[PDB]
Ligand binder design. Structure first.
Ligand SMILES: *C[C@@](O)(C(=O)O)c1ccccc1
Ligand SMILES: *C[C@@](O)(C(=O)O)c1ccccc1
Ligand SMILES: *C[C@@](O)(C(=O)O)c1ccccc1
Ligand SMILES: *C[C@@](O)(C(=O)O)c1ccccc1
Ligand SMILES: [Mg+2]
Ligand SMILES: [Mg+2]
Ligand SMILES: [Mg+2]
Ligand SMILES: [Mg+2]
Lengths: 357, 357, 357, 357
């Protein structure tokens, strides 16, 4: 009855006001693939995918364009569609770029389903819209800029910031955290992210020094696939270890949670499998007793977290702000879901043409 | 915006053509509580609860009637409602009759949400309607009646039956299974259910003899809360152990699956927490690799199983057939979801008055 | 020979001098069901059940009244009666309100057995009456009232108080504990109860700060059914984690103790299964090496704890003081068992009529 | 000193004499990306990648072409190159198509290193060339064609065949195996592959029936990422469970072997990370005591298996035979490594132009 009639993709590369510098490399621009999922009902679903590096941008677009044939004329039924794609990529490997591609379709299909029923996505999933606390995510900025950005964030009403650490010396890590604490006061949340840059002995040593400084969480201290190593670091700390932005699908989350790799989780809406993957992940987090935050995709995450039983923090990191209307607002540090059908993503078409690849 | 405006309940006690005789007692009639959830949008959600024994019928109705005050004027948002009820019964014990009461509300609220959007529940959950294979569930009927009912079931197109066993002697258990096999042929599925009547040594002994007869699964061989004892029985069998009809909420399922209590699961839509509890349970079954069947509530289960990744069998046991229209059909042994908004439950009002308690 | 001849129940709702405010809600009045179990020997057994909220009061009474038929004309043999009820509710779910109902009968049946033999219950169970240390249980009262109530309690001879915590900020939790310590001195026991209000990371953080303040125990820091999460909190503390008021039956206690969820236990006489459930629970606590305290039902708990090998503290929280005679006394902080047959519960009939629902 | 000077890729789609039909889909043609890695020493390294489906072919080529910039002017040092690529894709996800891309480069770089030193790759890795037993891999061919292909394979000197199974009924699985056994005699190896098509209960049931038929191994009975489910199937069998073709990198192998998922391993040279990933995987297989076979890439696998301590079988499945010279020979069922520098891959240029995409 409602059928998918087309898939259109546009690759853009948008410059970011502050490049996301990390201990393992810098994301200087946002390579995005903007997806339009056409339906027989006359509504168009919208989502975007983040390619992390320009190196993978054209390849991701191409993969989606070649995938268009297997979803056209399929019912607009995202759970059924996801099962069909899992099965079609069974032999090839339903992970990495292929999984991310599938999640893009999923997110657009749920946005389109929300538009067919004229209802915000959070209400379609059976929950009420509520304000979700958000933290402002910054990068490996050095002491001076890190302190300047955190003071701006408190002035805009955010009650917590995430800074990136993993400097050559632990004393630089501490200097950044202390200067931020000096400027914003002891009430403020300071999350820290190592972006997988430390081996386990180094991570235990540096994390116990940061724990004395009173940080909110320590994020991805070592290689993301090493769940066992994260469990080993977590067992030596009182502060929570946070991870999850790199889990491809709920099955990777399930393996990490099964061994006690972390006390907090933050799935990425794209890598976890879109809305369909997020519903499954929230059921896992609930049963393992894990507070669940988001990573990127702040527009759809505001919706998914209001439907998440152990919802913890929304990560504010506006990668797509230049190409979409500001319908998601931040008021007093909380994200406010737009009262719009679907996810509330509305392209700024004249701006997109400026970044087209 | 859509608000719950009222809750009306009616307790009925319906005589069953064949009483469900089990090794631990007989369900002679179906004690049901039929729920009408009124909304500000002018649609009325419908669900029913099964009380198992007339002893608990009036108490369950009363509990629901006293609960009416905490949900009236709440938004019709079943995930948010469920979280509020979990929290309101935090001190008292969010389990047993209270949980079952909450699930009744949930099922009615999702039926009403489906009616607000004019869509079958399965399509609201993001899946396509598909035919779900069903088995006919019979009872501890003795050799002659068990064989007569299984032959009728094959004639109606069912490709599997469940019989209840747990007779004084193992040789009576085997005689029933063998006579059914003789009559319906070696292709047919014969599920067997012990209804918690055996201790673990007895269950290992009787199950290994039944396994040589080639049964489809062995259901609840010992006390349902003894997950460890079920794991012990399962480790001595090649045939799967089936359980789950008695789990109150996905947290009980999570404990049983975590220790490997069974190779198959069959949540009860009421005891697992309604639609909201079923979505969480299907995410668990998927990650633990457990084929998931249903127990009772065949009308809503046809919908929930089409949205369940490891969906296995629908249990046909028509407890409410006298008071609701036959919109769910069985064709060639498969349940066919009605193309009706919500769940497709339509009361037969003149019949209800005949059974009112 | 001694037969049960009748069961009479009365629901009352008694206002409490101090409402029990907790972090997850307030128990403003005591909804009680007072049970009279008539026997052929001419003695009447007495017990009461606590319904936690008025919402479940009439339903609990109704359930007991409908259950009356299965116990009338049964021998006054509480272990045999309990096995019969476990078996009769096998299919339905021998937990929640049904289990609590069964425990009410059990407690009344043991009180009646004590009256048939003219002996205090503790002596019927084979033990000597001894004074049991008791703590006074208070609620989420804020700094000023919490300090006022603790000073009154020391003046009445209690050597320990339990306060409820779980305020929005940890600093409010600490302020309450510190002001109480300031007023009553460093010798005094300060137990703290979170009433399941924290997630595991939050509970580890807040509990390690309270541990530095020197609290006696930390009670139910997270959701009560999450035994694994309690084990995780307990492994990060030197102070004991206390729980158990919400275990329905010794089988739930057995699961929690098997995984090391807590270092202390405090079964509720009603939820654990009455006297018959308490004897089984004390055998479990003894073998796992768990000091065992009580939750509510201070009249029968004074008796059961004198028969409990690892008996630790009696919780004084007088919910039924308005409707029963003060035969249980507190002398120098110890509960003194009355030298009366059975449990020593004697209704104040003119007062009951004031609270009848 | 030896520097990489360029990377050239060509995508071809080659028709296969027998399409590889499996229980989860058919690989009708071989979508390949042929890689030429130019060096400053004037030798050109060669490798190819298998894309499984035409849907991912152009995307894989594009990814490699965009990756060319990060390896040009790097030393021809494959272990150092691999570490740099792991680090460059740290944030993005060093798995799926990106990992496969990196492995293509690795295989070409080791072929080029072998050409710089004028030595066959196996001798560069420190081992002697030896004949490696090979089995002929067939597909889900039905009884008649499966028997015809196995008889041809015995006539060509192969002493074992792999057939694909996973037919609707177990009786079709058995019929295929029995007819092959009838035709080739009881000495012959019959491997069977389910290609992830069964859930765990079904896999235990079907595998125990196949075990009575005397099959050599049972390959990927359930979803490949479900290591725990494979462990569960393996614990119920005497016959070995075989898997590994889908592990992306030695870290996935390490997780599966750590839990005892299988008794045999067969890494895919591309998915495991090329030569550099294969050396690491062989060290793992040796210490866990796992006989190690290969999956596809028969030209480089003949070399890697002669250097593998627990080397078991080479899989003969000639996907690239139309575009490369037949330098690898099969004599008496054994693969014979060519006495050529590097891997021994020599393009048939006029044929490539016929399949260019
Ligand atoms: C059939 C297969 O699993 C094998 O050879 O083991 C395979 C899977 C994908 C492509 C080729 C072969
Ligand atoms: C406050 C409590 O947890 C306790 O006394 O430990 C409690 C909970 C419900 C009712 C009364 C008391
Ligand atoms: C018989 C039963 O266990 C089943 O259908 O599996 C059942 C138990 C209680 C009520 C109805 C059916
Ligand atoms: C910095 C990061 O880890 C985070 O926000 O947590 C990140 C990683 C890749 C891209 C964006 C952000
Ligand atoms: Mg991060
Ligand atoms: Mg059953
Ligand atoms: Mg308490
Ligand atoms: Mg294979």
């Amino acid at each position: 009855e409602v059928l998918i009639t087309g898939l259109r993709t546009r690759a853009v590369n948008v410059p970011l006001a502050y490049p996301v510098h990390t201990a393992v490399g810098t994301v200087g621009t946002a390579p995005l693939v903007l997806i339009d999922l056409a339906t027989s009902a006359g509504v168009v679903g919208h989502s975007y995918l983040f390619a992390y590096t320009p190196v993978a941008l054209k390849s991701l677009k191409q993969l989606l364009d070649d995938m268009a044939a297997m979803i056209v004329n399929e019912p607009l039924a995202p759970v059924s569609l996801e099962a069909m794609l899992a099965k079609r990529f069974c032999l090839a490997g339903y992970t990495g770029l292929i999984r991310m591609a599938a999640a893009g379709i999923d997110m657009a299909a749920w946005d389109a389903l929300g538009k067919v029923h004229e209802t915000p996505l959070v209400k379609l999933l059976g929950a009420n819209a509520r304000p979700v606390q958000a933290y402002d995510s910054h990068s490996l900025d050095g002491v001076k800029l890190a302190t300047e950005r955190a003071v701006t964030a408190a002035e805009l009403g955010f009650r917590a910031v995430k800074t990136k650490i993993g400097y050559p010396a632990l004393d630089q890590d501490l200097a950044v955290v202390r200067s931020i604490r000096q400027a914003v006061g002891d009430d403020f949340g300071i999350m820290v992210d190592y972006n997988q840059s430390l081996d386990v002995p180094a991570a235990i040593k540096r994390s116990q020094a940061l724990q004395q400084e009173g940080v909110t969480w320590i994020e991805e201290p070592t290689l993301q696939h090493d769940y066992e190593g994260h469990q080993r670091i977590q067992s030596k700390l009182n502060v929570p270890v946070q991870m999850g932005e790199n889990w491809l699908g709920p099955e990777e989350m399930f393996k990490a949670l099964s061994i006690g790799a972390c006390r907090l989780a933050m799935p990425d809406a794209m890598k976890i499998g879109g809305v369909t993957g997020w519903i499954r992940a929230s059921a896992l987090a609930q049963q393992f007793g894990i507070p669940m935050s988001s990573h990127l995709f702040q527009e759809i995450s505001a919706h998914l977290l209001a439907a998440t039983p152990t919802a913890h923090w929304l990560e504010r990191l506006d990668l797509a702000g230049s190409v979409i209307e500001p319908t998601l607002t931040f008021e007093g540090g909380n994200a406010v879901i737009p009262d719009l059908p679907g996810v509330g993503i509305i392209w700024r078409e004249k701006e997109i043409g400026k970044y087209l690849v």
